[PDB]
């Protein structure tokens, strides 16, 4: 190698802290795209309500029931 | 009899001896504990934030439940 192997040990010797400035900040962009865990965090952010939920008038509707615990809508129960 | 200052050397105090030596840290072994504490750090912290989510949804549920308010 002309740039991979040559410009690595010299960077560790001369100005060694500059290695960390490119490696840590670089991997900070790569990791949130390839690793399959980021999709879970987006769901809980949207599920947690900030304001009170609005009630709609019932006229031929599916997956919608009363306020009591029943199998209706989505309702998040991901990981305990 | 003549009495003067007597000569004594015994151990010679050791002429120029190095005391500075590598201790505790080796090099590669410190990174295994260093970055190892970081990986243990995030895993312990994020589990608490998932336990915070149990409290979070339950806190906002109180506002939805209270309509006479």
From Swiss-Prot, chain A:
Location (main, coarse): mitochondrion
GO CC terms of this entry: mitochondrial inner membrane; mitochondrion; respiratory chain complex I
Keyword annotations from UniProtKB, A to Z:
Acetylation, Electron transport, Membrane, Mitochondrion, Mitochondrion inner membrane, Respiratory chain, Transmembrane, Transmembrane helix, Transport
Q: How is it placed in the membrane, per its record?
A: Single-pass membrane protein
Provide the protein's localization.
Mitochondrion inner membrane
Could you list the residue ranges that cross the membrane? Answer: 17-37
Q: Which domain of life is it from?
A: Eukaryota
For whether the record's keyword set contains Heme, the answer is no
**Positions carrying N-acetylalanine:** 1
Known function: Accessory subunit of the mitochondrial membrane respiratory chain NADH dehydrogenase (Complex I), that is believed not to be involved in catalysis. Complex I functions in the transfer of electrons from NADH to the respiratory chain. The immediate electron acceptor for the enzyme is believed to be ubiquinone.
Assembly, in brief, is: Complex I is composed of 45 different subunits.
Which family is it part of?
A: Belongs to the complex I NDUFA3 subunit family.
Q: What is this protein called?
A: NADH dehydrogenase [ubiquinone] 1 alpha subcomplex subunit 3
- Where does this protein come from, organism-wise? Bos taurus
Which taxonomic lineage does the organism of this UniProt entry have?
Answer: Eukaryota, Metazoa, Chordata, Craniata, Vertebrata
- Counting on the full-length protein, the chain here runs from 2 to 46 of 84
Curated annotation (Swiss-Prot), chain B:
Q: Which organism is it from?
A: Bos taurus
Q: Where are the transmembrane segments?
A: 27-46
Full-sequence range covered: 32 to 74 of 144
Protein name stated in the entry: NADH dehydrogenase [ubiquinone] 1 alpha subcomplex subunit 13
What family classification does the UniProt entry report for this protein? Belongs to the complex I NDUFA13 subunit family.
Question: How does this polypeptide assemble, per the annotation?
Answer: Complex I is composed of 45 different subunits. Interacts with CARD15, but not with CARD4. Interacts with STAT3, but not with STAT1, STAT2 and STAT5A. Interacts with OLFM4.
**What role does this protein play?**
Accessory subunit of the mitochondrial membrane respiratory chain NADH dehydrogenase (Complex I), that is believed not to be involved in catalysis. Complex I functions in the transfer of electrons from NADH to the respiratory chain. The immediate electron acceptor for the enzyme is believed to be ubiquinone. Involved in the interferon/all-trans-retinoic acid (IFN/RA) induced cell death. This apoptotic activity is inhibited by interaction with viral IRF1. Prevents the transactivation of STAT3 target genes.
Domain of life, per lineage:
Eukaryota
Gene name?
Answer: NDUFA13
Task: State its location(s).
Answer: Mitochondrion inner membrane; Nucleus
